[PDB]
C-alpha cells in the first residue's frame, strides 16, 4: 500500500459485513455478473460471494439475493454460474482499436514517422506513429491513439462503424513513395469466450484471434471470466529494458504517455531478460501483481513455477488470464481491456437446465437442499420448465429435498382475490397457465407460497426476491437448534429474519384453499415485524406416508446415514458375522434416534428369514427397517365456555 512500513489512515464508503456462521449446506445455479462459468464452486460467507461472483444489478439480483439470504443462515453454498455460450464474451486488448489496412506500402519511411487522421479533410488527430518498418522503409506496423477519433465518431453519431472519408496521410522528414493506409471499423465487439482455466489453452490460441494480436503487436492477456467487470481492468506490463531505465510507458489502445509505478509496487524488478512484471488495477486500486516468465521453464525464489501458461492455468488468478503462445518481444505497454459483455438477459432454458445437471450425481456431492427458487424471477415458461426439471433431479437422486417457487408474474402487485386463484391455477395447470403449468407429484419437492420485499444493501434499493432461499435457510439452520425430524414451521422456530413485507397475506378462507393444493403458506406473525413459515406439505397429490416435510427430512437423515454404514459391507462375505455386524451397528444408531424422540419404535430385520440361499447365489444382501415416525400437533382447538354465576364447578366439573 505504502512502500515503507507504517500506519495508513483513510476515509471511504465500503460494505464490511459480519457473519452468523451456523452450520448448513445447500446448492444453487444462477446468472451472476462475474466469476467462473459451468464450474462448481464453494462460497462460505457474504464477502467471498461479493469478491468471487460480484455485486447484484438489475438483471441478476434475484439469484444474488437468493444466494445471499441462504448464506445468512447456513455456511456452505455450493454454487454454479451459467452464461449463454453464443452471446457472452471476455474483455480483450483488441477492443476500440481501428481496423487499419495497408493500401500502399511506401518506401524509405522510419520508426516515429507521423500518421495523420482526417475526416471530411478536417484533421482529427496527427499524434499517431509508424511503429515498425522493414529495411526498405515500407510500413509494417502503425499505432493510432483512438480516443481522439472516438471523440469525433461519438458526437457525429458514427462510433460503431466509420464512413468513407476517413483518411490516413503518412507525413515525415524522409519518404521515397507516399504510403497509404485505409481505416475500416472501430472493433467494439470482442473476440473470445473463456470460461474454465483447465480448458483454456486452445480457446486462447486459435489462429484467427492470434493473428489479430500479432497484427496490433499486443500481449495475449484477457479478462479471466466472461462479464462486464472486465471493462474496468487496466494492466501495467513492464520488462527489464523499461524498468531499469525508468521510462515513460505508452497506453494502449486509447493513446497517452505515463510514468511507471512498478518499482514502487514491488520491492525489485523482474530479474532477467525473459521476465515481464504484471500489475493489474481496477478503479485505480491494485488487485494483483506478479513476476512471470516466457521461458518454457523458469523458477521464482522458492522454486515454484512461473512460466506464463502454467501460472494462470493452475488456477492462481481471478482477474486476468494470459498465454506465452504469441507474446510480443520486450513489450512494456499499459493495456486497458474492453468489450467484455455478460449477455445475461439472453439466458434461455437450455442454460439453466445444463447448469442444474452438474448436481445430478448422487455420489459426488452430499447436498441436502436444492434451492431452485431464483429461477422464479424469469418469465413463466422458463420458471416452469426449469423447476419441473430440478424436481426430476430429486427424483433421480432420491436423497435430498428440492424447493420450488411461483414466478414473480403470479403474485407481485395482483389483487388478493385474484392472486390466490392465479396461484392455485398455476399449481394444477389451468387457465392461462396450462402451458407454464405445475404438475409435479413427487415427495422430494416443497412448493413455497409467497414472495418477499427486501433491502439490497449493495445498490441501496428495495427489491422483490423469490422466497425459496429463506425456506432453505430454515430447513438448514434447524439442524443446529433441534434435530432433523423437527418441523421448520411454527413460532418458537421458523422466523424468516430480514423482511419489509410479503406480496400477499392469505386470510383463513384462502389459506385453506392453498394448503389443500400442497402450497406451504408463509405469513406475518400474529403481530409486529415477525414473519413465519406456517405449514408443512411436500408437493404430493396422491396420499403417502412421506407427506409432511418433517417425515421426508427424517427418512432422508436415516437413508443418508445407514446408506453410508452399509457401504462398509460391500465386497464382504454374506456370512453370519456380516449380518450380526450390520444388525448391531444400525440398531445402535436407531436407538439414539429413539432416545432423542425421532421415532416411537423401530425394528431391524436381517437374518435367514430373508437372506435365504436363493439371494446369496446372486451376490445380493438384504435388510428391512420398520420405522414409525413421530406425530406432531398441527390443529389446536380451544373452547371457552361462558358459564353463569352460581352453577358451581364442584357440581359441573367435580374436582
Amino acid at each position: 500500500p505504502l512502500v515503507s512500513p507504517g500506519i495508513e489512515l483513510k476515509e471511504t464508503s465500503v460494505q464490511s459485513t459480519v457473519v452468523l456462521n451456523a452450520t448448513g449446506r445447500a446448492a444453487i445455479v444462477g446468472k451472476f455478473q462475474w466469476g467462473p462459468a459451468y464450474q462448481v464452486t464453494q462460497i462460505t460467507n457474504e464477502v467471498e460471494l461479493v469478491d468471487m461472483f460480484g455485486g447484484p444489478n438489475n438483471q441478476t439480483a434475484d439469484y444474488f439475493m437468493s444466494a445471499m439470504n441462504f448464506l445468512q443462515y447456513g455456511n456452505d453454498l455450493r454454487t454454479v454460474r451459467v452464461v449463454n455460450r453464443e452471446a457472452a464474451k471476455n474483455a480483450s486488448p483488441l477492443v476500440d482499436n481501428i481496423e487499419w489496412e495497408i493500401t500502399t506500402a511506401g518506401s524509405n519511411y522510419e520508426v516515429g514517422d507521423k500518421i495523420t487522421v482526417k475526416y471530411a479533410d478536417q484533421v482529427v488527430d496527427d499524434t499517431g506513429s509508424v511503429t515498425e518498418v522493414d529495411s526498405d522503409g515500407k510500413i509494417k506496423s502503425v499505432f493510432i491513439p483512438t480516443s481522439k477519433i472516438i471523440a469525433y465518431a461519438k458526437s457525429i453519431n458514427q462510433y460503431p462503424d466509420l464512413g468513407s472519408s476517413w483518411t490516413t496521410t503518412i507525413t515525415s522528414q524522409s519518404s521515397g513513395v507516399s504510403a497509404v493506409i485505409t481505416l475500416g471499423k472501430i472493433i467494439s465487439d470482442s473476440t473470445v469466450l473463456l470460461t474454465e482455466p483447465e480448458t483454456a489453452h486452445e480457446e486462447m490460441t486459435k489462429t484467427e484471434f492470434q493473428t489479430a494480436l500479432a497484427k496490433y503487436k499486443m500481449p495475449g492477456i484477457v479478462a479471466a471470466y466472461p462479464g462486464e467487470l472486465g471493462n474496468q481492468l487496466e494492466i501495467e506490463i513492464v520488462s527489464k529494458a523499461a524498468f531499469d531505465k525508468g521510462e515513460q510507458l505508452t497506453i494502449y489502445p486509447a493513446g497517452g504517455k505515463r510514468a511507471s509505478t512498478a518499482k514502487a509496487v514491488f520491492g525489485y524488478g523482474p530479474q532477467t531478460d525473459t521476465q515481464y512484471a504484471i500489475i493489474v488495477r481496477r478503479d485505480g486500486a491494485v488487485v494483483e501483481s506478479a513476476v512471470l516468465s516466457t521461458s518454457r521453464q523458469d523458477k521464482d525464489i522458492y522454486g515454484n513455477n512461473i512460466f506464463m501458461d502454467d501460472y494462470f492455468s493452475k488456477g492462481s488468478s481471478r482477474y486476468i488470464f494470459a498465454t506465452a503462445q504469441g507474446w510480443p518481444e520486450g513489450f512494456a505497454g499499459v493495456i486497458r481491456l474492453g468489450g467484455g459483455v455478460s449477455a445475461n438477459e439472453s439466458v434461455t432454458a437450455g442454460d439453466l437446465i445444463q447448469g442444474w445437471d452438474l448436481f445430478g450425481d448422487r455420489e459426488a456431492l452430499r447436498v441436502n437442499l436444492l434451492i431452485a427458487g431464483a429461477c422464479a424471477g424469469e418469465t413463466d415458461e422458463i420458471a416452469s420448465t426449469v423447476q419441473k426439471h430440478v424436481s426430476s433431479i430429486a427424483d433421480e437422486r432420491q436423497d435430498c429435498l428440492a424447493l420450488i417457487s411461483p414466478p414473480r408474474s403470479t403474485i407481485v402487485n395482483i389483487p388478493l382475490t385474484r392472486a390466490v386463484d392465479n396461484l392455485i391455477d398455476w399449481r394444477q395447470g389451468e387457465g392461462s397457465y396450462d402451458s407454464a403449468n405445475m404438475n409435479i407429484n413427487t415427495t422430494y419437492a416443497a412448493i413455497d407460497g409467497n414472495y418477499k420485499y427486501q433491502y439490497d444493501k449493495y445498490n441501496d434499493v428495495n427489491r422483490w426476491v423469490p422466497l425459496a432461499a429463506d425456506i432453505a435457510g430454515l430447513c438448514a439452520r434447524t439442524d443446529d437448534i433441534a434435530q432433523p425430524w423437527m418441523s421448520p414451521a411454527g413460532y418458537r422456530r421458523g422466523q424468516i429474519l430480514n423482511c419489509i413485507k410479503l406480496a400477499i397475506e392469505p386470510r383463513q378462507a384462502h389459506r385453506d384453499r392453498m394448503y389443500q393444493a400442497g402450497i406451504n403458506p408463509v405469513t406475518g406473525q400474529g403481530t409486529g415485524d415477525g414473519f413465519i413459515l406456517f405449514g408443512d406439505k411436500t408437493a404430493t397429490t396422491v396420499p403417502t406416508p412421506f407427506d409432511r416435510i418433517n417425515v421426508r427430512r427424517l427418512f432422508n437423515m436415516l437413508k443418508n446415514n445407514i446408506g453410508d454404514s452399509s457401504k462398509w459391507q460391500l465386497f464382504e462375505l454374506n456370512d453370519n458375522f456380516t449380518r450380526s455386524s450390520f444388525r448391531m451397528e444400525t440398531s445402535q444408531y436407531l436407538a439414539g434416534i429413539k432416545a432423542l424422540g425421532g421415532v416411537y419404535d423401530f425394528r431391524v430385520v436381517c437374518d435367514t428369514t430373508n437372506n435365504t440361499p436363493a439371494v446369496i447365489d446372486r451376490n445380493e444382501f438384504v435388510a428391512s427397517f420398520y420405522i414409525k415416525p413421530a406425530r406432531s400437533i398441527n390443529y389446536i382447538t380451544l373452547n371457552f365456555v361462558a358459564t353463569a354465576t352460581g352453577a358451581d364447578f364442584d357440581e359441573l366439573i367435580g374436582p
Partner: protein, 162 residues
C-alpha cells in the same frame, strides 16, 4: 428408558470443567497459557420480601456482582507477576509515590472461553468489562514446600460480564 440421559447431551457432550482459557489483551498471548484456574462468573439478583397480612411474597431486587478470582502459574523471571503489579501500580502507586491514573486508564477488557472436546472449537465466550487487580496474592515460599510449581491467586474487580 436409561438411554433418556442422551437428551442431556444433544449438543454432543457434557461441558468439561478444565477445557477453558482466559484472554487478557493487556498482558499479551502468554498470560492465556499461564492462567491455571478461573470461575466462570456468578450472576446475583438479591430478592426483596414484600409483606401482606402475615405472609410474604418475593420481588426482584437489584443486580450485583462479586469479584473474579483467578490462579496463575509463575515463570522463573516473573513475566506475569511483575506485569500484574505494574498494572495495579496505575490504580494506586506501589512504593513511595502517592499517585494513580484516571479510571479510563487502569480499567481493561478480558475474555473467558470454554472449548468443545474438539480443541479447535469455542462453544461459550464471556467478555468481562473493566477488570483491574484489587489484590495480587502472596506467594507462600518455604524450604519445606518442595515438589510444587509456584502459583498465586489474583482477585480482579469487574463492572459486568456478557
Amino acid at each position: 428408558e436409561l438411554t433418556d440421559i442422551t437428551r442431556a447431551f444433544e449438543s454432543g457432550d457434557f461441558a468439561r470443567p478444565n477445557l477453558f482459557e482466559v484472554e487478557i489483551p493487556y498482558l499479551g498471548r502468554n498470560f492465556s497459557f499461564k492462567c491455571k484456574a478461573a470461575p466462570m462468573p456468578a450472576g446475583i439478583v438479591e430478592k426483596v420480601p414484600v409483606g401482606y397480612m402475615n405472609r410474604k411474597i418475593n420481588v426482584a431486587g437489584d443486580r450485583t456482582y462479586d469479584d473474579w478470582t483467578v490462579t496463575i502459574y509463575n515463570d522463573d523471571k516473573h513475566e506475569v507477576r511483575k506485569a500484574i503489579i505494574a498494572w495495579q501500580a496505575q490504580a494506586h502507586a506501589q512504593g513511595n509515590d502517592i499517585s494513580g491514573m484516571t479510571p479510563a486508564d487502569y480499567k481493561k477488557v478480558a475474555t473467558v472461553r470454554q472449548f468443545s472436546r474438539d480443541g479447535k472449537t469455542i462453544t461459550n465466550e464471556h467478555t468481562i468489562t473493566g477488570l483491574w487487580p484489587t489484590n495480587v496474592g502472596e506467594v507462600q515460599m518455604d524450604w519445606d514446600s518442595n515438589n510444587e510449581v509456584e502459583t498465586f491467586e489474583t482477585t480482579f474487580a469487574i463492572d459486568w460480564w456478557e
